[PDB]
Amino acid sequence: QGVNCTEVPVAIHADQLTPTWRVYSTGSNVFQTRAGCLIGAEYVNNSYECDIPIGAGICASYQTQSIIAYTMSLGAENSVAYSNNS
Amino acid sequence: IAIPTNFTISVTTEILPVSMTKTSVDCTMYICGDSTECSNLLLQYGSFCTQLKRALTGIAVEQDKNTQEVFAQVKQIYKTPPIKYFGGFNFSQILPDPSKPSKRSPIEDLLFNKVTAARDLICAQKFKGLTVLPPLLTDEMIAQYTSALLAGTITSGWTFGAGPALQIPFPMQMAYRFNGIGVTQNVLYENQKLIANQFNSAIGKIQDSLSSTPSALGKLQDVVNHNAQALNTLVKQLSSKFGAISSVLNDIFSRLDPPEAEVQIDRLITGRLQSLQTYVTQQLIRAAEIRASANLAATKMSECVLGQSKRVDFCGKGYHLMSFPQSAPHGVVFLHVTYVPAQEKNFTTAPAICHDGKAHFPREGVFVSNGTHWFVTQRNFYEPQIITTDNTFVSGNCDVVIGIVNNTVYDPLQPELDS
Amino acid sequence: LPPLLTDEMIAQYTSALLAGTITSGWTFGAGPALQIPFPMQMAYRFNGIGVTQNVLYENQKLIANQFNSAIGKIQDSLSSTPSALGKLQDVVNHNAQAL
Amino acid sequence: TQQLIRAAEIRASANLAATKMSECVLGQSKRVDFCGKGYHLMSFPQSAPH
Amino acid sequence: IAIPTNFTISVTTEILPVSMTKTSVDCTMYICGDSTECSNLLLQYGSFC
Ligand SMILES: *[C@@H]1O[C@H](CO)[C@@H](O[C@@H]2O[C@H](CO)[C@@H](O)[C@H](O)[C@H]2NC(C)=O)[C@H](O)[C@H]1NC(C)=O
Ligand SMILES: *[C@@H]1O[C@H](CO)[C@@H](O[C@@H]2O[C@H](CO)[C@@H](O)[C@H](O)[C@H]2NC(C)=O)[C@H](O)[C@H]1NC(C)=O
Ligand SMILES: *[C@@H]1O[C@H](CO)[C@@H](O[C@@H]2O[C@H](CO)[C@@H](O)[C@H](O)[C@H]2NC(C)=O)[C@H](O)[C@H]1NC(C)=O
Ligand SMILES: *[C@@H]1O[C@H](CO)[C@@H](O[C@@H]2O[C@H](CO)[C@@H](O)[C@H](O)[C@H]2NC(C)=O)[C@H](O)[C@H]1NC(C)=O
Ligand SMILES: *[C@@H]1O[C@H](CO)[C@@H](O[C@@H]2O[C@H](CO)[C@@H](O)[C@H](O)[C@H]2NC(C)=O)[C@H](O)[C@H]1NC(C)=O
Ligand SMILES: *[C@@H]1O[C@H](CO)[C@@H](O[C@@H]2O[C@H](CO)[C@@H](O)[C@H](O)[C@H]2NC(C)=O)[C@H](O)[C@H]1NC(C)=O
Ligand SMILES: *[C@@H]1O[C@H](CO)[C@@H](O[C@@H]2O[C@H](CO)[C@@H](O)[C@H](O)[C@H]2NC(C)=O)[C@H](O)[C@H]1NC(C)=O
Ligand SMILES: *[C@@H]1O[C@H](CO)[C@@H](O)[C@H](O)[C@H]1NC(C)=O
Numbered sequence: 001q002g003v004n005c006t007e008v009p010v011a012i013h014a015d016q017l018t019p020t021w022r023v024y025s026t027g028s029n030v031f032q033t034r035a036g037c038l039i040g041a042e043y044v045n046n047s048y049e050c051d052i053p054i055g056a057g058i059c060a061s062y063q064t065q066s067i068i069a070y071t072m073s074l075g076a077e078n079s080v081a082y083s084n085n086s
Numbered sequence: 087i088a089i090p091t092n093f094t095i096s097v098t099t100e101i102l103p104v105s106m107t108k109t110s111v112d113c114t115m116y117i118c119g120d121s122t123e124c125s126n127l128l129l130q131y132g133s134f135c136t137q138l139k140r141a142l143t144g145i146a147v148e149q150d151k152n153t154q155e156v157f158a159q160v161k162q163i164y165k166t167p168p169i170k171y172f173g174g175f176n177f178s179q180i181l182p183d184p185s186k187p188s189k190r191s192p193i194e195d196l197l198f199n200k201v202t203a204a205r206d207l208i209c210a211q212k213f214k215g216l217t218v219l220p221p222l223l224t225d226e227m228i229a230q231y232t233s234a235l236l237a238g239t240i241t242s243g244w245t246f247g248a249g250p251a252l253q254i255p256f257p258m259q260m261a262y263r264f265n266g267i268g269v270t271q272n273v274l275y276e277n278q279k280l281i282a283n284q285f286n287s288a289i290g291k292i293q294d295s296l297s298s299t300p301s302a303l304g305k306l307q308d309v310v311n312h313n314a315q316a317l318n319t320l321v322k323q324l325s326s327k328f329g330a331i332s333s334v335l336n337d338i339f340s341r342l343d344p345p346e347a348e349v350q351i352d353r354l355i356t357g358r359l360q361s362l363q364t365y366v367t368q369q370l371i372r373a374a375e376i377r378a379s380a381n382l383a384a385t386k387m388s389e390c391v392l393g394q395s396k397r398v399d400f401c402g403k404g405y406h407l408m409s410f411p412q413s414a415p416h417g418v419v420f421l422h423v424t425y426v427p428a429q430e431k432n433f434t435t436a437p438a439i440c441h442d443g444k445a446h447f448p449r450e451g452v453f454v455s456n457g458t459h460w461f462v463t464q465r466n467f468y469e470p471q472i473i474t475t476d477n478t479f480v481s482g483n484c485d486v487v488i489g490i491v492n493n494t495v496y497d498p499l500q501p502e503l504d505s
Numbered sequence: 506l507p508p509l510l511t512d513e514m515i516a517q518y519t520s521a522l523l524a525g526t527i528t529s530g531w532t533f534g535a536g537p538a539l540q541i542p543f544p545m546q547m548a549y550r551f552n553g554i555g556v557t558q559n560v561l562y563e564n565q566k567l568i569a570n571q572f573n574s575a576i577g578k579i580q581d582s583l584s585s586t587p588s589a590l591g592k593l594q595d596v597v598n599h600n601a602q603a604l
Numbered sequence: 605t606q607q608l609i610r611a612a613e614i615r616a617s618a619n620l621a622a623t624k625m626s627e628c629v630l631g632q633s634k635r636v637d638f639c640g641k642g643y644h645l646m647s648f649p650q651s652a653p654h
Numbered sequence: 655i656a657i658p659t660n661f662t663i664s665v666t667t668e669i670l671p672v673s674m675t676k677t678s679v680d681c682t683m684y685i686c687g688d689s690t691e692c693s694n695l696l697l698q699y700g701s702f703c
Contacts, residue, residue: 001110002217034220053150056220057227074230078162080241084173084255088539319701326700357700371608378616398631404535426536437545437562447558452545465549481559488544488565506676515651522629522649534630547645553632554643568663575665582667592671593654596614600675603606607677614674621670640666654673 005030005037031069033058038069047073087435089454089468090427095281097288098402098424099296101305102383103417105153105221106376107313108146109369112215113138116324117358124335127351134359141366145373150222152380156418157223157231159387164237164251172256174282177240179289180410180421182233190229196296197414198225201306211317214324228413235411239391247392260407266394267405267425268466285423292421306417312372320365328357383418387411390420427466436460436491439473440484446495449477460493472496625649 008025009016016022023039031038035055050059050072060069113135118124166181182189190198208218242251243259254262257278261271274281296302327333330350331341338350390401390409401409402422410421433454439446451462454470461470462477471477474496484490529538530546544565548558561568583589628639628647639647681703686692 001219002212050222053222055222057222057224072227074158074227075161075163075234077165078251079165080167080237080251080253082167082241082253084171084257086253086255087541087545090537090539323700327698328700329695329698361700367605371612374612396634397627398531398534399626427532427539428537430537430539435542435545437548438559445559447562481557482563487559487562506678508673508676512651519649519651526629526646526648531631534626550632550645554645571663572665575663579665579667589667590652590669592669593652596654596671596674599610600677604677611674614671617671618673621672624668624670640664640668642664645663652669654671 001036003036005032005039008037008039033069041067041069043069045070047071049073087433087452087454088430089433089463090430090466091468092427092429093467094426094428095284095288095407096402096404096424096426097285097292098422099292099302100386100402100420100422101303101414101417102379102386102420103306103309103376104156104380104383105149105416106145106309106373107416108149108219108221109313109317110142110146110217110219111135111138111362111365112217113362115215116320116362117355119335121336121339123339124351128355131355131359135362138362138366141370145369146219148373148377152377153221153223153228156380156384156387157228157413159384159392160231160234160238160246162251163230163234164241164246166233166237166240172240173260174278175256176286176289179293180236180412182229188229189226189233191412193293193296193419194229194232194412194414197303197412197419200296200300200303201310201415207314207318211321214321216317216320225413232411232413235387235391239408239410244393247388263394263407264425267407268464269425270464270467270469273467273469288423303414306414309376309416316365316368320361323358323361326357328353330354386420387418390422431468436489438484438487438490439478439493439495440490441493441495443483444480445482445484445487445490446473446478446480449479451477460491474498 011022028040029042031043041060047070051061054060057071058069059072114125179192182191238246241253243254245252261274264274265271325333330353332338338347389395391411395401395406402424404424404426407423407425412419436453448462451464454461454463462473463470525533528540530541532539548561551561552558627633629649633639633644682693686696
């Protein structure tokens with residue numbers, strides 16, 4: 001949360017407070033959101049209803065099977081055939 | 087009796103806060119700072135800050151719930167027709183503007199503008215373990231929801247709030263709403279231009295009033311202010327000694343022996359923990375207040391925007407006609423359109439009419455006299471008519487009603503039969 | 506600290522509300538106050554609940570009598586019982602206990 | 605803290621009182637059991653200590 | 655079906671609290687009273703008041 005993740009711990013033997021469960025950065029779909037940096041989720045261009053809220057309009061889900069991140073959809077488009085004699 | 091002879095279309099505003107700022111606290115960094123040896127003593131106090139994290143997470147989830155329950159009341163995203171003719175009503179001041187990149191209305195932009203190299207305050211607070219979490223819904227999404235609600239209420243009336251959206255011309259919808267407050271349809275159909283002009287002028291006056299005055303949104307601004315101050319105080323509490331020799335623990339540790347350093351660090355830790363607990367309690371109380379306000383806003387969205395309300399003074403001052411929503415930073419603004427009587431006149435009135443030994447009462451209106459002659463009119467608008475058997479009903483004789491008067495009730499059948 | 510509004514001002518506000526509702530019905534709550542005879546507005550209110558107007562006009566005196574009696578009974582409920590105003594007393598007692 | 609909680613409760617009660625003043629005194633209400641038991645006709649306000 | 659043939663006019667009462675007592679507290683008078691050195695020591699405790 002709130003990390004540019006260009007400063008994410010590359011790590012050698014011990015330079016991170018988390019108890020040394022380093023997750024691979026380059027090869028595990030690092031993504032940058034306004035809520036921070038997400039590791040282990042693939043960003044897709046589709047849009048579904050929110051499943052797990054990440055933040056700033058970004059949600060995550062388990063689909064395909066892997067974890068994906070996307071922008072939530074507010075609903076299905078609809079247009080009313082307005083006229084002034086109908 | 088006094089009967090109005092004219093009317094006015096009024097537009098008023100109501101501002102309601104919806105959501106609060108979501109904050110997060112790093113307990114170890116706030117209390118012991120960067121010194122890795124102070125944190126060892128913190129473990130001897132139990133699970134003191136897991137409760138803090140739990141409460142703050144609950145508040146953060148509740149804020150998103152508030153926003154969702156206020157603004158996400160539409161199943162589909164309705165789109166306004168490309169042609170913006172609605173019988174003379176303009177609506178251009180509340181519809182989204184496509185030229186601007188924000189896709190916001192001329193009034194939403196003003197609202198967002200109104201509500202608000204040395205280290206910034208945000209960075210200074212962040213360097214001590216206090217952070218702000220972004221909301222789930224962005225401003226663009228809330229603007230989209232508001233636009234969908236506006237398009238639905240302009241194209242379908244109140245039908246889209248109870249099922250499938252059914253199209254209806256705007257003049258006919260306004261006639262329905264006039265019928266809803268006890269005024270006949272021909273009153274609107276014979277004054278369409280005047281009513282449209284009055285509505286447009288009122289919308290322009292809302293424009294000018296919101297643009298000129300700068301203290302109208304103090305309800306929302308307070309919500310912002312009460313947050314910032316609450317954080318600032320916390321930071322200031324880091325500069326108090328709480329009875330110790332100094333407020334810097336590195337100096338204490340590099341200065342003297344553990345036997346007294348224990349007491350110094352203990353009193354510092356107790357003071358910091360007390361400050362954090364007080365902050366959390368105040369946050370919980372303020373969250374309850376915000377939740378009540380958001381519930382009221384959701385009820386008003388359901389009952390004033392998605393329908394026509396008969397409750398007095400719930401959706402403005404006067405007889406409610408309709409309502410339009412707009413989004414504002416951390417809140418919502420309702421524009422209420424209401425009907426106000428004007429230009430009343432004096433008349434003499436009677437409760438019943440005596441004719442042929444029978445008492446007649448008006449079916450819908452009231453009996454009035456201009457000085458020599460008697461008519462029957464609707465209650466909210468002066469429109470005299472000849473008293474016939476088609477707008478009256480008979481009950482009993484004239485010996486029971488107090489105040490009955492003598493007049494003639496015209497039978498439409500006799501002239502047609504004799505001709 | 507003393508409240509901003511005194512009891513006389515609140516009594517004035519209540520008297521204004523009562524006078525408006527007695528002389529004008531519900532019109533003063535939505536715009537200009539329009540006068541109407543009290544019997545006619547009572548007939549309007551009877552129409553509001555689904556009863557025809559004549560039912561009032563043919564039973565006026567009796568209805569009035571009933572109303573009067575009811576008001577009198579209310580007074581007895583405030584001159585025989587000592588637990589009707591318990592909520593305000595509870596507020597006062599809670600403040601005093603905290604202090 | 606206790607004073608703040610009590611103030612919140614009092615504010616809720618005052619909001620209800622304002623709504624009842626608006627809807628039962630300034631108009632005729634169709635809501636069931638909001639302005640008494642039975643079919644509401646009218647309402648009259650009186651002031652009391654607090 | 656059952657249909658009424660008469661009616662009754664009923665008057666009932668409802669009591670609602672509106673306001674609360676407004677109180678103010680003097681810190682140093684409650685905590686320290688008339689002792690100056692207690693006030694000097696309390697001036698170091700922050701901005702609780
Ligand atoms: C009924 O609807 C039609 C269809 O929109 C209206 O025709 C429009 O009239 C305006 C008048 O300035 C034109 O600018 C539009 O270009 C017309 N529409 C199209 C598709 O060309 C018609 O005016 C409406 N009826 C009334 C009485 O206004
Ligand atoms: C009802 O009020 C409207 C104004 O709200 C009156 O319309 C005005 O009429 C005068 C004519 O003397 C014009 O000079 C004004 O420009 C009109 N105003 C607007 C806004 O159009 C209307 O005449 C009134 N009706 C009655 C019966 O008195
Ligand atoms: C609807 O309202 C807009 C805005 O008030 C009107 O646009 C104005 O039109 C006049 C005359 O052409 C111009 O002098 C103003 O500069 C315009 N203002 C803006 C903000 O564009 C518009 O004429 C009104 N009517 C319609 C049919 O759109
Ligand atoms: C209806 O009649 C009443 C009664 O005359 C009018 O009220 C009077 O208004 C004048 C102002 O010109 C006052 O000087 C009188 O004192 C009022 N009388 C009372 C008894 O208060 C009222 O103005 C009339 N309304 C209209 C629209 O003509
Ligand atoms: C009250 O209404 C009556 C009915 O309209 C008015 O009487 C009419 O007055 C005009 C004006 O000269 C005459 O042309 C009509 O022939 C009259 N009608 C009838 C049926 O005779 C009356 O003027 C109005 N005003 C008063 C004070 O009575
Ligand atoms: C309305 O008309 C009736 C009769 O059409 C009037 O009743 C008459 O009142 C006079 C009083 O001077 C009696 O002498 C008559 O015997 C009554 N008529 C009948 C048929 O009994 C009544 O007075 C009229 N109302 C008003 C206000 O003048
Ligand atoms: C409806 O009820 C009222 C009372 O609630 C009845 O009025 C009473 O009638 C008797 C006999 O005439 C009198 O002794 C009482 O004094 C009346 N009561 C009041 C308060 O005036 C009325 O008669 C009933 N209606 C019917 C049709 O029986
Ligand atoms: C995050 O890192 C990228 C890449 O170095 C940089 O361009 C960007 O300015 C940083 N900050 C944000 C908020 O994206």
